[PDB]
Amino acid sequence: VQQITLGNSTITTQCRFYTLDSKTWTTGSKGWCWKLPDALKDMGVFGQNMFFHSLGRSGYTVHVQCNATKFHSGCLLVVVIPEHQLPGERGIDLLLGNLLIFPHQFINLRTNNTATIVIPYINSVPIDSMNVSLMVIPIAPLTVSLPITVTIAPMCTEFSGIRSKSIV
Amino acid sequence: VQQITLGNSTITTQCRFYTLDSKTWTTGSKGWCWKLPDALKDMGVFGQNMFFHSLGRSGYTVHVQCNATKFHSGCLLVVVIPEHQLPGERGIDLLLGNLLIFPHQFINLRTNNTATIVIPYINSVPIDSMNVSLMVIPIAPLTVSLPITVTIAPMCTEFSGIRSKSIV
Amino acid sequence: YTGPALSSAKLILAYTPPGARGPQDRREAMLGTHVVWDIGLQSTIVMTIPWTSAGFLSCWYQTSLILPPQVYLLSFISACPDFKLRLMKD
Amino acid sequence: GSETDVECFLGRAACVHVTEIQNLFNDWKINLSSLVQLRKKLELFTYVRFDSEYTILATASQLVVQAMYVPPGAPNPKEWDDYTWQSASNPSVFFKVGDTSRFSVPYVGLASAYNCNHMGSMAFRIVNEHTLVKIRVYHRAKHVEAWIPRAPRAL
Amino acid sequence: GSETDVECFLGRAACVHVTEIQNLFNDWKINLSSLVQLRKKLELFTYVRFDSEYTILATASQLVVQAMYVPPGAPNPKEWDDYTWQSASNPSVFFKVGDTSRFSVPYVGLASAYNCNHMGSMAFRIVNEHTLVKIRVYHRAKHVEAWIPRAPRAL
C-alpha cells in the first residue's frame, strides 16, 4: 500500500533503503548530482561488499521525495544519465531541453511530490569493477526553502566468485 | 578420502578450517590450553560475527595433528573440558588421571599422529553471549622438539535475529 | 617435494584473487583461499586457479621442516581445457 | 522510411583520414572522432557495435603502396625500414598508385560494443626503393547496433 | 578458438626472400629456415607436411619477369643466357613488373613429411634484352599436418 519494507528498512512513499542526506532546495539552487555506486561507497554493508569484491553488478531503485505542504510552487526534473562525463554520499551541489531523452520523472509541487526510477544494470560488459549519474534540477523556481530526500535501493545485485573459490 | 575441504579451506588429515599457530613440543613443556570461542575472537569472519551479534550458538570439530617422522617417542592427551575454571589465539602455554572422564583422544607417536574431536554445543541455556576449553598435555615425554598444529572448524553455528529484525 | 621420506612439514599454499594485494603474514594467507599441505603425507599437491582474464599465489611455513638425523619443491604449470587464445601476434 | 534506419543513417562512406607519403611513412591510430560530421551523429548513442570496410585511394604528383592494418595491442612502424612491415601477423595490402584498395576489418574490441575502444592503426608506405602520394581513407560502418540515445551536443 | 588451429597458426603469408635483378639473375634454394619468425613457430614440431602457395611481387626503380620454379634434384640456372631458362620440364611464370604472380607447388618431398627436406629452388630474371627490380616472395603453407611437439628454442 504505502509502507514498502525492504530488509531491515521501512519507508513511506507512493536490498535495503539507503537515504542520503536531505538537501535544502532554496530559490537560487541550480540542482544536485550523484554518481552511482559512488554515492554508496561509505554506505554501511553495501560499501563493504563494493570495496571487498574486485568486480560487481547491481540494479537500483531511486525514490526522490520532497516533504512539503500544499502551498508551495515549482518543479524538479529527476534524470538518470548512463555514463555521464565532465564526490561521495554528499553529491555535487550545482542542452537541458534534450535531457528528457534520458529516463526522467518531473516532480511538480502543484500536483506531485515523489518520483520513483527503477534503473537496470547498463554496461558494455556483463560484470565490472565498481557507472550512472542521477541529477536533480529545479526547472521552475520555488515560490512560497524545501527539503529533498534521495533514497537508493540497490537490487538484483551480484558480485565476483573469486576470494570465495576453493583450489582443492 | 584424505583431503577434507570446508568452504574456502582445504586440509589433509585422516564452516571453515582455522589453523591456530603451530606450538613446539619440547621435552620439558607441560602442555597448552585454549578456551573456545575465545581462541577464535581474532579469527577473521568468525571473530566479526562473534563480536557483531550479541548472542550465538556453535559446535566445533577440532583436528590436532603433530607433523613428525616415524623415529620419535611420547604421547599427548588432547582433552576438551566443558566449563573449565581457575588468552586469545595464542592459548595458555603451561587430578590428571581422572581427566579421561572428559571426551579425549590420546595421540601416541609410536602408533598415531592425529586426533579428531566433534564437540556439540553444551550449555544450561539454548543460546548465549559468546564456554569449553581444549587442553593438550604431553604425558609420556618426547625422546628423539616436534610441531603441534590445532585446527578448529566451527560447525552448525547460529546467531541472534536482533539487529536484522524489521519493526514495520 | 623431493626431500627424504622421513622428513615432514605443513606448508600452506595461498591464492590471492586478481585486484587484491599479496599477503605479508601466515594469518593473512590462511584467512583467504588456501590448501594446508602436509608434505610427509602427500608428495604432490595439484591446485586449479579460478577463471581469469592476474592475481598472486604464495606458500608459507605453518610448521618448521622436521629433517631426519636444504631440500626442494618443484613447481609445474599448465592450462585447463577451458583456456582460450584469441588474437595472433608477431 | 528506410533512411531513418541506423544502417542508413550511420553506415555510409566518409573521408576519415588524409595523409601524404614520399619516395617516407605515416601511421594513423584509428579514431572516428577526428571527423566532426561523423562524430556528431555517432555521439548521440552511448554504445555502438559495428564491423568496418576501409577503401583506400592513392593519387600521385611531382608506384606501389603498402597499407598495413595493425590489430589492437600490436606495435606501429617507426621508420621505413622497420621489421613491422615485413611481419606476417599484421595484414597488409599492396596496390598500385592511382586506383583504390578495399578491405573489411571485423568488430575489433574488448567490450561488446565501442563506447563513444581500441580499433587499431593503419600504416602507409610506398615500397619502391632508390613523387608525393596523397592517401585518402574512406571508412563505412557495417552491421551497426546502437543502444542508449543521448542528448545531441550543442557546443 | 579457430586461431589455435595449425592452419591458422602456421598457414599465413610472410616475406621469405627479397632479391634485386638488373636489365642479371638470382636463384634462391627454398629454405623456410631463413625467416626466424616462421622458423621459431615451425621448429616446435619435428615433422610437418604442407603444400605451398608462392605470391611473387616485382617492383621497379631507376618489363617482364620470368620466375621459374625448379623441382628437387634438377639443376639451377648459372647465367642469364643458360639453357635451363628455355627448358620445358621446369615450370615458369611470365608477369609484368609492378603487379604480382601466384602459383601453388604441391608437397614436394622424399619422406612423408619435412623434418625441421629438398623443397627445390626459384630463379628470377627479366626477359627484356639490350632498371633495378626488387622481388619479394611471400610463401603460405597449405593443408598443414604436424606430429611431435618439441620444446621451444630459447637461444
Curated annotation (Swiss-Prot), chains A, B:
Localization, UniProt: Virion; Host cytoplasm
Subunit record text: Interacts with capsid protein VP1 and capsid protein VP3 in the mature capsid.
Function, as annotated: Forms an icosahedral capsid of pseudo T=3 symmetry with capsid proteins VP2 and VP3. The capsid is 300 Angstroms in diameter, composed of 60 copies of each capsid protein and enclosing the viral positive strand RNA genome.
Protein name stated in the entry: Capsid protein VP2
Organism: Human rhinovirus 14
Full protein: residues contained: 82 to 329 of 2179
Curated annotation (Swiss-Prot), chain C:
Protein name: Capsid protein VP3
Species name: Human rhinovirus 14
Function: Forms an icosahedral capsid of pseudo T=3 symmetry with capsid proteins VP2 and VP3. The capsid is 300 Angstroms in diameter, composed of 60 copies of each capsid protein and enclosing the viral positive strand RNA genome.
Subunit structure: Interacts with capsid protein VP0 and capsid protein VP1 to form heterotrimeric protomers. Five protomers subsequently associate to form pentamers which serve as building blocks for the capsid. Interacts with capsid protein VP4 in the mature capsid. Interacts with protein 2C; this interaction may be important for virion morphogenesis.
Compartment(s) of residence: Virion; Host cytoplasm
